[PDB]
Amino acid sequence: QLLDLAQKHFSGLSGTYDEDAVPTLSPCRFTGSQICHREDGLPLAHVAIAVEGPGWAHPDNVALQVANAIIGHYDCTYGG
Amino acid sequence: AEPEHDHRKRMGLKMLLMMGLLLPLVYAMKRHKWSVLKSRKLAYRPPK
Numbered sequence: 001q002l003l004d005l006a007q008k009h010f011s012g013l014s015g016t017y018d019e020d021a022v023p024t025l026s027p028c029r030f031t032g033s034q035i036c037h038r039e040d041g042l043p044l045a046h047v048a049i050a051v052e053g054p055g056w057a058h059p060d061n062v063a064l065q066v067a068n069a070i071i072g073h074y075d076c077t078y079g080g
Numbered sequence: 081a082e083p084e085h086d087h088r089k090r091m092g093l094k095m096l097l098m099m100g101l102l103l104p105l106v107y108a109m110k111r112h113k114w115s116v117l118k119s120r121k122l123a124y125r126p127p128k
Contacts (some may be wrong), residue, residue: 034116 030052054060111118 053064
């Protein structure tokens with residue numbers, strides 16, 4: 001029923017396609033750097049620190065996620 | 081008067097050769113550590 005609907009309503013993008021220009025993503029350079037926005041009028045500091053990860057496809061996102069799970073997450077309303 | 085004459089001069093050459101290797105290398109260690117500060121860019125963004 002979904003494929004039926006997809007042909008019923010989306011078919012209308014045929015005719016001709018991609019005949020003049022096609023865009024594929026270029027890799028993006030990671031830079032080990034720092035940005036410090038110093039504001040002594042806000043009551044709490046926010047800090048986000050990161051290394052370069054591998055990307056969607058990489059099999060070793062699983063092991064990363066596991067390591068992340070171990071460290072986890074905390075918030076003042078946790079009862080533990 | 082100065083028996084050690086030869087030895088000091090022998091050591092002095094070694095000192096000069098050591099410093100010639102060491103002085104540029106420690107400077108290079110300093111610069112790379114200091115580079116985080118030497119290329120830092122400031123911007124002031126006051127409100128309103």
